Amino acid sequence: KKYTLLAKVTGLEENPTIIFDCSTNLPTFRKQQYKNVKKSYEEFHQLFKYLNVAIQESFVPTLPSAYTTFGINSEEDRMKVTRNFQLWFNRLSQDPLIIRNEEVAFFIESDFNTYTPINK
């Protein structure tokens, strides 16, 4: 009965890339299954910055630390950062008012490294 947004962070690659699959039934999306979505950290910052000021009635989860995300040096670091982005996606998906915002869809569906908000 509920709208759902399920992200599975599958890996990472200045401006690191976060790789994830996405499953949703939200009518704001073009389709339902997305595989190997690639988003740069700066695109995440753009989405957070929009949501933080656009949805002030909700708590928008703070992004994983840029310092630790940009500072990956061990495979252990890589796993910890992967888990951090997984936790971020999980908390985002748990707010039904946030996932209804079409900027979430535009972020996920736009070309790698191109997302800035459509809405002002």
UniProtKB/Swiss-Prot annotation:
Bridged cysteine pairs (disulfide): none
Record note on disruption phenotype: Leads to hyper-fragmentation of the vacuoles upon hyperosmotic stress.
Domain PX positions: 5-115
Compartments where located: Endomembrane system
Function recorded in the entry: Component of the membrane-associated retromer complex which is essential in endosome-to-Golgi retrograde transport. The VPS5-VPS17 subcomplex may assemble onto the membrane to promote vesicle formation and is required for recycling the vacuolar protein-sorting receptor. Required for the sorting and delivery of a subset of soluble vacuolar hydrolases. Required for retention of late Golgi membrane proteins and vacuolar biogenesis. Involved in vacuolar fragmentation during hyperosmotic stress.
Similarity field: Belongs to the VPS17 family.
Domain notes: The C-terminal half, which contain the coiled-coils domains, is necessary and sufficient for interaction with VPS5.
Miscellaneous comment: Present with 7380 molecules/cell in log phase SD medium.
Record protein name field: Vacuolar protein sorting-associated protein 17
Gene source species: Saccharomyces cerevisiae (strain ATCC 204508 / S288c)
Gene designation: VPS17
